[PDB]
Amino acid sequence: GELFVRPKLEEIPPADQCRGFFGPLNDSLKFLRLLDIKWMMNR
Amino acid sequence: EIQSRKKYFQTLGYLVAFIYLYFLMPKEKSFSGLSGPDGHWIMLPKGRPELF
Amino acid sequence: STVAISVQGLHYVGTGLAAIALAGVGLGIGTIFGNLLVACARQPNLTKMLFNYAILGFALTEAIGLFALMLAFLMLFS
Amino acid sequence: STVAISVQGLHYVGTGLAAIALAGVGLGIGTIFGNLLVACARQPNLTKMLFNYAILGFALTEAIGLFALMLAFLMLFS
Amino acid sequence: STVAISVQGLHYVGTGLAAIALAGVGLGIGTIFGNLLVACARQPNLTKMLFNYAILGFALTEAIGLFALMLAFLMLFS
Amino acid sequence: STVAISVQGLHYVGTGLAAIALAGVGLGIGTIFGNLLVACARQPNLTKMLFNYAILGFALTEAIGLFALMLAFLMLFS
Amino acid sequence: VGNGPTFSTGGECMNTCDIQNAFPMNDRGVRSSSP
Amino acid sequence: MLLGGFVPRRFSQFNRDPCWMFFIFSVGFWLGEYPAMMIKYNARDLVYDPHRYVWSHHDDHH
Amino acid sequence: LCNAASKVQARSAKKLAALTDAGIQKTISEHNANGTDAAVSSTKRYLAEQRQLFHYRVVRFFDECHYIISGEYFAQYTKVNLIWDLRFLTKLVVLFLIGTVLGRQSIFPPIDPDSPLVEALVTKVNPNY
Amino acid sequence: VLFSTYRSSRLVSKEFLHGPVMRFRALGEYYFQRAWNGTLNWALPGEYRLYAVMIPFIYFYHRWHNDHTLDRDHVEKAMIMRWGGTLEDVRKLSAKDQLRVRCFTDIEKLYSAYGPKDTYLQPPGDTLPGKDFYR
Amino acid sequence: VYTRWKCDRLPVFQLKLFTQEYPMHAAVGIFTIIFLWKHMSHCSEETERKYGWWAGYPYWRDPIARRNETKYKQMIINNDVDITHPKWTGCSVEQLEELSRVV
Amino acid sequence: YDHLASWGKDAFLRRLEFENGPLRDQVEAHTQRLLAERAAIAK
Amino acid sequence: YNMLVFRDPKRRPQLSEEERAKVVVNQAEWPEEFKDFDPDDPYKNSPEIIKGMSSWNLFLWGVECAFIYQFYELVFPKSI
Amino acid sequence: MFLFFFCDLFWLRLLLCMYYCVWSRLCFIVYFNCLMLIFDFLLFCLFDLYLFVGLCLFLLLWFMLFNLYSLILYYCITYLNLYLLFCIVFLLYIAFLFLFCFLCDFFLFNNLLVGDSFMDVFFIRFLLCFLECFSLLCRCLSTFLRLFCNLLSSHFLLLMFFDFFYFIFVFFFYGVFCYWFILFIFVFCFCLLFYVFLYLLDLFAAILQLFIFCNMILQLIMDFLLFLLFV
Amino acid sequence: LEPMSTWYLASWAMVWYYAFFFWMPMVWT
Amino acid sequence: SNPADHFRPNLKALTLYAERQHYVDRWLHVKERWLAPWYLPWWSPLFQLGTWYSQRSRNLFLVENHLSYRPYKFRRNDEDRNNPY
Ligand SMILES: CCCCCCCCCCCCCCCCCC(=O)OC[C@H](COP(=O)([O-])OCC(O)COP(=O)([O-])OC[C@@H](COC(=O)CCCCCCCCCCCCCCCCC)OC(=O)CCCCCCCCCCCCCCCCC)OC(=O)CCCCCCCCCCCCCCCCC
Ligand SMILES: CCCCCCCCCCCCCCCCCC(=O)OC[C@H](COP(=O)([O-])OCC(O)COP(=O)([O-])OC[C@@H](COC(=O)CCCCCCCCCCCCCCCCC)OC(=O)CCCCCCCCCCCCCCCCC)OC(=O)CCCCCCCCCCCCCCCCC
Ligand SMILES: CCCCCCCCCCCCCCCCCC(=O)OC[C@H](COP(=O)([O-])OCC(O)COP(=O)([O-])OC[C@@H](COC(=O)CCCCCCCCCCCCCCCCC)OC(=O)CCCCCCCCCCCCCCCCC)OC(=O)CCCCCCCCCCCCCCCCC
Ligand SMILES: CCCCCCCCCCCCCCCCCC(=O)OC[C@H](COP(=O)([O-])OCC(O)COP(=O)([O-])OC[C@@H](COC(=O)CCCCCCCCCCCCCCCCC)OC(=O)CCCCCCCCCCCCCCCCC)OC(=O)CCCCCCCCCCCCCCCCC
Ligand SMILES: CCCCCCCCCCCCCCCCCC(=O)OC[C@H](COP(=O)([O-])OCC[N+](C)(C)C)OC(=O)CCCCCCCCCCCCCCCCC
Ligand SMILES: CCCCCCCCCCCCCCCCCC(=O)OC[C@H](COP(=O)([O-])OCC[N+](C)(C)C)OC(=O)CCCCCCCCCCCCCCCCC
Ligand SMILES: CCCCCCCC/C=C/CCCCCCCC(=O)OC[C@H](COP(=O)(O)OCCN)OC(=O)CCCCCCC/C=C/CCCCCCCC
C-alpha cells in the first residue's frame, strides 16, 4: 500500500522485551530463543 | 503501400484457405471410412535390426 | 458381482429440487421491489430511473430462475 | 457377499441439488439492486458510478451460480 | 450375515450437496456489494477505499466456495 | 434374521452434508464485511481498528469452516 | 464533391471527449472531427 | 458499436441498399426453411425406420 | 367485444385518413358518396383489363422470343440481367420440385414392394392416413 | 549482411500490382473508413450493414460445413448400424430407402428431448426387429 | 525516426517483443508447452475408442487394428525382424514346427 | 482517394451530403418546422 | 426510428430559433431524391438498386432457396 | 499423439486483413482501466505498470472474436477447454507474479502478514498470511474457472432452448389453422421473447466476463505497485 | 465432455500458443 | 450427451502417432550430432545445457525405489481402474 521505511537503529526495541510461547526468554534462557519459533516471529 | 500489398496477398491466401477448410477438407476419422484419414504412425525405426 | 439398476421415477425427485431454486429467485425479486418503494418514497422525483433498474434486476434474477427451470423441465423429460 | 452395484438415475438427484445453489445466487443479486435503489435515492449524483459497481457485483455473484450449474450439466450428461 | 454393497452412483448426491454451499457464498457477496453501494452514497469521497475492502471480502468469501467446489471434483471424478 | 450390510458409497453423502456448513461461514463473512463498509463511511477515522476487528471475526468463522472441512475430509477418506 | 473518407474519429463525439480541447470549435459551436 | 448507417424504415425499403437486399434474402431463407420442414417432416407418407429399435444413440452413449 | 371493434375501426379510419394519395382519396370519397365499394371496383377493373390484355400478352411473348432468339438480348447483357436470370433459374428449380411432389401426390418417393421398408407401411398406426 | 533487418529494404517496385491492390483497398475502405464505423476493440464495428452482410454469410458457410461434413457422420453411423452394421449392407438399399432412413434421423434430431420416446424405446409386444436382430 | 514496430521486419520485431518486452511471459509459455508435451501428449487405444471418434468408434472395421498392423508390418520389414525367434514365441523353432503339424 | 471515385455515393452518403451540405440550414429549418407541427398536432 | 436494434441517426440542430426563423426554404434547389423530406422516412423516394426488384421478391427468393435446400434430395436422392 | 486442426477465425482473419490495411482510430475499449492506473496527479511508478496494455488489448480482441461471434449458430469456440484456459491464465498470472518476485524485494511481501502488532503473531497473523498466500492462487483458479463456466452454461442453455423452439415450431405450427390457435400464438410469442432476452443476456455477459478477466490480472498487478510522489 | 478432457490437450493448446507467439506480433504492428 | 457433443473443435484434419521411445531416440541422435564436433568443448555452457539436466533426470529415475507400482505409461487400455496392466 504505502511506502515502507526501515526502522533506525535506535527505534528497534531490545531483544529482552520479546516474548515467546510462554514468556520472555531472558537471561539463563537466551539460548532457547533459537528454538522458539513464536519468539523469533515476535522479534 | 507495403501493407496494402501484403494484406492483399494475405487476403487471397486466407480466402483460399477458407474455401478449402469449409468446402473441400474432409473431417478425419469418419465412421464409414469414406472420407478423411484414420491416422497413422510416424518416426518408425528403419534399418536398425539391433533395436529388436 | 456386477449388478446394475435403472430407476424410472428418480427424475421426478431431481426436478422438484430444481424448483426449489425458484424460492430464492421469487424472494429476491420481492426484495428489489420492496427497496424500490422505499427509494421512491425517499426520492419521489426518481420514479422512472429506479423503475428501470428494478426491471434490470428482475431480468437478471429471472434469467437465473430460467437457468434452473431449464434443468427442471429437462430432467422431467429424460 | 460383495456386489458392485451401479444405479443410473442418481445423476438426476445430484443435479437437482446443484440447482439449489441458484436460490442463493438469485437472492443475492436482488439484494445488490435493492441497496442500489436505496443508494441512488440517497445520492443520485453518483447513480452511474453506483450502477457500474452493481454490475460488477452481479457479475461476481452470478459467476458462483455458474459453477454449480456446470456441475449439474456434468452429472446430467454423464 | 456379512453383505458388502458397493453403490457406484452415490457420488452425484454428495457432489450436489457440496454445490449447495455456494448459495451462502453468493448471498454473502450480494450482501457485501449492497452494503458497499449504500456506504458509497453516504461517504462518496472514500469510495475507492471501500471498494478495496469489498474486494478483500470477496477474496475471503470466494475461497470458501472453492473448497466446497474442490470436494465436488474429489467426489465427482472418483 | 440378522443382516450386516456395509455400503461403500455413503461417505460421499456425509461429506456433502458437512460441506453445506460453509454456506453459513460465507454468509457470516459477507455480513462482517458489509457492516465494516457501512461503519467505515460512518466513522472513517477508525478504519484500521474496524479492519482489525473484522479480520478477527473472519478468522473465527474460518476456524469453524476448518472444523467442517476436517469432518468432510475424514468422512471422505475414512 | 467526392466520396472519400476523412480524418478518422473512432465513432467519438469531440464535444464531450477527454481531448476535446485539441479539436477546434467553429462558429456554430461544434468541435471539429480533426485537427 | 451500432452508431449509424442506412436503416430501412419498413420492409419495402430493404431494396434501397445492396447489403439490406442480401439481409432480406437471408431472412427469407431463415423463415422459409421452417415451413419446408413442417411440410417435409409432417408428411403423410413419412414412415419411421422399421429398424429404429435395432440401434439408437441412447444405447451408444450409455 | 364492442370496445375492441370500435378501437379497430378508429385505427383503420385514422390510417385511411393519413395516406396522402390524391387518386386513392378521390376514389374513396366518390364511392362513399355513391355508397359503393372501391376495393371490389378495383378488382373488377383489374380483371377486365387482364381480359382485354390477353392477346397483348401473347404478342409480347412472341416479340420477346424473337428478341432472345435473334441474339440481341445477349449483345447488351449486363450484371443485372445475370441477377434476374439467376432468380429465374431458382424459380424454375423450385417449381420443378413442387411439380414432382404434386405429380406423385407424395412428399417422399413411394416404396417398392421388394423394399425392406414395406414393413413400415404394414405397421402404420392409422391405415387411413 | 545476408538479410536486412529493416522493412525499408524493398523486394519489389512501388508500382507492382498497383491496380489490383487499389481495387482491394477501395473495397476495404468504402464502408469501414467512416465516422460512424467506430469499432469496439476492433471486433464490433459501428456500421449496421456490416452486421447485416456478415452474420448471414457466417451462418451460411458454417451451416453448409455442419450439414455436409459433421452431421453426415452421425447420419451414416445410424444408417450402418440400423441396416446391417456394414457399409455394403447399406449400399444394398436403394437411394429412396436411404432417403427415408436419413429423414427419420432428422426427425429424431428435431424431437431430441421433447419428442415421443417410442422412436427409440420399443414398447412391449411390438413386432418390429430388436437390438439382437443382426447378431 | 527509428521505431521497432515500423522499421524492423516481422521476425526481428517478434524476437524483440518477446525478449525485451515480454521475456518472462515467453519463458512461462515455453515452460507450459514443455509440460504439456511431457505429460499431456498420449492417448491409449481404449481412450480413443471411448472419446476419440466424432460419431463413435467403428468396430465393424476396427481402424485401430489396421493402423497397428501397418505399423508392425512396416517395422518388421524395414528392420529385418525374425518374428519366429524363440524370444517372441517362447519356444524353439522345432517345437513350433511340431505345433504346426499338430494343429 | 481517386480509387474510390468509381463507387459513387450510396443512399446514406447522399443523405449526409444533403443534410450537411451548403443547404444544411434550409434542411434543418424545414425538419424542425415539420417536427414542431407534428408535435403540436399530437398534443 | 428503429429496425430491430438498428436506430436511425438524427442530426442535432445547430441553429437557434431566432436564426432558424429567418431561413428561407427553397425546395427547388433540393435534389429530386430528397423533396418533401421527412425525418421519419428519409428514403421513401430513394431509387431502387435494381429496377423492378422488390424487397418481397428477394424475400421470396430466399424462401425458394430454402425450399430447394430441403426438397432437392426428395426428387434426386443419392446413395451413400 | 499429434492432432492437426485449425481455429474458426479464418474468415475473421480475412476481414481483419481487408479492413485494417489502413489505419483507424480506436476510442472504445472493453477494459479501459489498464490505460489509467493512476488517478491522483504527481504520483508516478518506477515499475513497468503499463506493460499489461498490449497483452490486454490482444486478449480482448482474441476472446471477442471467439466469444461474441459464437452466438451465431454453428460457430465454434475452438479454445473452449478447462485446462487450456488454465494454461492461459497460468501464463499471464504467473508471469506477472514472477516479475514481482524476480525483483528480489522481500519487503514487498510485508503486507501479506495481515493485521497489526497487537494481534498474536503465530495464532492469528501467520494464519492470515497462510490464507492470503492461498488466496492469490485461488484468485488465478477462480478467474479461469469463471471464464470457462460462463461460456459453457450460456451455450448449453441456448442450445436447449433452440431445440425446444425448433420442436414446437415445426411440429405444432398446424395449430394456427385449428381452434387452439391462441395457445400456440401465446407460446410462440413467449418463445420469441425468450429468444431475444437470451441473446441480449449473452451479448452483455460475454463483454462483462472479458472485463472481469482483465480486471483480475490488473488487480494482481495493482496489489504490488508502489507510487512515489513528485517533489 | 471434450471441454473436460485431456487426451489431446497439448495439440489443443498449440492454438493459443501460436496465437500468442506468432499472431500477436502481426496484430501489434 | 447430445448437447455436450456440440462443444468440440470442428476443423480436425489429421492425427499422427509416434512412440515416446522412437522420437526420444531421434532427438538424442540429433543432440549427439550437434554436440559431437570438437569445436564445442564439453565445458562450454551450451554442451552442459544440452546434457546435464537430462543426465540428472535419468539418474533420478534410475535411483527411484518405490514401494508402489506405477503402471506402464503407454498401455493399450488405461481406462480401467481395477486393471493396472
Ligand atoms: C383433397 C382435394 C379436395 C378438393 C375439394 C374441391 C376443391 C374446389 C373445387 C371447386 C368447388 C366449387 C367452387 C367453390 C368456390 C368457392 C370459392 C370462391 O368462389 O371464392 C370467391 C369468393 C368471393 O366471391 P364473390 O363474393 O363473388 O366476390 C365478389 C367480388 O369479386 C369481390 O372482389 P374482391 O375485390 O373482394 O376480391 C378479393 C376477395 C376475393 O378473393 C378470392 O377470390 C380469394 C380466393 C378464392 C378461392 C378460395 C377458395 C377457398 C377454399 C378453402 C381454402 C383453400 C385454400 C385457399 C387459399 C387462398 C389463398 C388466398 O377476397 C376474399 O374473398 C377474401 C376472403 C378472406 C377474408 C379474410 C377475412 C378474415 C377476418 C378474420 C377476423 C377474425 C376476428 C376474430 C375476433 C374474435 C374475437 C372474440 O371468396 C371466397 O369465397 C373466399 C374464401 C376464402 C376461404 C379461406 C379459408 C382458409 C382456411 C381457414 C383459415 C385458416 C388459417 C387462418 C386461421 C386464423 C384464426 C381464426
Ligand atoms: C530492389 C529490387 C526490385 C525488384 C523488382 C521486382 C518486381 C517484380 C516482382 C518480383 C517477383 C515477386 C517477388 C516476391 C513477391 C511476394 C509477394 C509480395 O509482393 O509480398 C509483399 C511484399 C513485397 O516486398 P516489399 O513490400 O517490397 O518489402 C517487404 C519488406 O521489406 C519487409 O516485409 P515485412 O517484414 O513487413 O513482412 C514480410 C513477412 C514477414 O516475414 C516473413 O514471413 C519472412 C520469414 C518467414 C519464414 C517462414 C518459414 C519458416 C520455417 C521454419 C524455419 C525453417 C528452418 C530451416 C533450416 C534449414 C534446414 C535444413 O510478412 C508476412 O508474413 C505477411 C505477408 C505474407 C504474404 C502472404 C503469403 C501467402 C500468399 C498466398 C497467395 C496464393 C494462395 C493460393 C492460391 C491457389 C490458387 C489455386 O513481400 C513480402 O512482404 C515478403 C513476404 C515473404 C513471405 C515468405 C513466406 C514463405 C512461406 C513458404 C516457405 C516454404 C519453405 C519450403 C521448405 C521445404 C523443405 C522441405
Ligand atoms: C538442431 C537443433 C538443436 C539441436 C540440439 C542442440 C544442443 C542442445 C540444445 C539445448 C537442449 C536443451 C535440453 C533440455 C533443457 C531443459 C528443458 C527440458 O526439460 O527439456 C525437456 C525436453 C528435452 O529433453 P532432454 O531433457 O534433452 O532429454 C531427453 C529426455 O529423455 C526426454 O524426456 P521427456 O520425458 O522430457 O521427453 C518428453 C518430450 C517432451 O518434449 C517436449 O515437451 C517438446 C517441447 C518443445 C518446446 C519448444 C520450445 C520453443 C517454442 C517456441 C514457441 C512456439 C509456439 C507454439 C507454436 C505452435 C505452432 C508451430 O521430450 C522429447 O521428446 C524432446 C524432444 C525435443 C524436440 C524439440 C523440437 C522443437 C520444435 C520447435 C518447433 C517450432 C515451430 C515454429 C514454426 C513457426 C513457423 C512460422 O524438451 C526440450 O528441451 C524442448 C526444447 C528443446 C529446444 C532445442 C533448441 C531450440 C530448437 C531447435 C530446433 C528447432 C526446429 C524447428 C523446426 C521447424 C519446423 C517447421
Ligand atoms: C504426412 C501428411 C502431411 C502432414 C505432415 C505433417 C508433419 C508433422 C510433423 C510432426 C509435428 C508434431 C507436432 C504437431 C502439432 C500440431 C498442433 C496444431 O495443429 O495446433 C493447432 C494450431 C492451429 O493454429 P491456427 O490458429 O489455425 O493458425 C495456424 C494457421 O496456419 C493460420 O495461421 P496464420 O494465418 O496466422 O499463419 C500465418 C499466415 C498468414 O496468412 C497467410 O499467409 C495466408 C495463407 C494461409 C496459409 C496457412 C493456412 C492453411 C489453411 C489450410 C490448408 C490450405 C490449403 C492446402 C491445400 C492442400 C492440398 C492437398 O501465413 C502462412 O501461413 C505462411 C505460409 C504461406 C504459404 C503460401 C504458399 C504459396 C505457394 C505458391 C506457389 C505458386 C507456384 C506457381 C508455379 C507456377 C508454375 C508454372 O496449429 C498451429 O499453430 C500450427 C501447427 C504446425 C506445427 C508444425 C507441423 C510441421 C510442419 C508440417 C508441414 C507439412 C508440409 C507438407 C504438406 C504437403 C501436402 C500433404
Ligand atoms: C455491438 C452489438 C452488436 C449486436 C448486433 C445485433 C444483430 C441483430 C441481428 C438480427 C437477426 C439477424 C438474422 C440473420 C439471419 C441469417 C440467416 C439465417 O438463417 O440465420 C439463422 C441463424 C440461426 O437461426 P435458427 O437457430 O432459427 O436456425 C434454424 C436452422 N435449423 C432449424 C437448421 C437449426 O440466426 C442466427 O444465428 C442469428 C443470431 C445473431 C446474433 C447476433 C450476433 C452478433 C455477433 C456477431 C457480429 C458480426 C459482425 C461482423 C462485422 C465485421 C467485423 C470485422
Ligand atoms: C483425466 C485426468 C485429468 C487430470 C488433470 C490434472 C491437471 C492438469 C493441468 C494441465 C494444464 C495446466 C498446466 C500448468 C503448468 C504446470 C507446471 C508444472 O507443474 O510442471 C512441473 C513439471 C515438472 O517436470 P517433470 O515432471 O519432468 O519433473 C522431473 C522430476 N523427476 C525427474 C523427479 C521426475 O515441469 C515440466 O514438465 C517442465 C520441465 C522442464 C522445464 C524446466 C527445466 C528447469 C528446471 C529447474 C530446476 C531443476 C534443474 C536445476 C536448475 C537449472 C539448471 C540449468
Ligand atoms: C553468400 C554466398 C557465397 C557463395 C556464392 C554463392 C553464389 C550462388 C549463385 C547466386 C546467383 C543468384 C544471385 C541473385 C542475387 C542475390 C542477392 C541477395 O543475396 O539478396 C538477398 C535477398 C534478400 O534481400 P534483402 O533481405 O532485402 O537484403 C538484400 C540487401 N541487403 O534474398 C533473396 O531475395 C533470395 C535470393 C536467392 C538467390 C540465390 C542464392 C543462392 C546462394 C547459394 C549459396 C551456397 C553455395 C552455392 C554454390 C553454387 C556453385 C555453382
UniProtKB/TrEMBL annotation, chain G:
Keywords: Membrane, Transmembrane, Transmembrane helix. The chain holds residues 18 to 52 of 156 of the full protein. It comes from the Eukaryota. This is Uncharacterized protein. The keyword Membrane applies. GO terms for cellular component: mitochondrion.
From TrEMBL, chain K:
GO terms for cellular component: mitochondrion. This is Uncharacterized protein. The lineage of its organism: Eukaryota, Discoba, Euglenozoa, Kinetoplastea, Metakinetoplastina. The gene is Tb03.27C5.274.
From TrEMBL, chain M:
It comes from the Eukaryota. This is Uncharacterized protein. The lineage of its organism: Eukaryota, Discoba, Euglenozoa, Kinetoplastea, Metakinetoplastina. The chain holds residues 90 to 169 of 169 of the full protein.
From TrEMBL, chain P:
One of its GO terms (cellular component) is mitochondrion. This is Uncharacterized protein. It comes from Trypanosoma brucei brucei (strain 927/4 GUTat10.1).
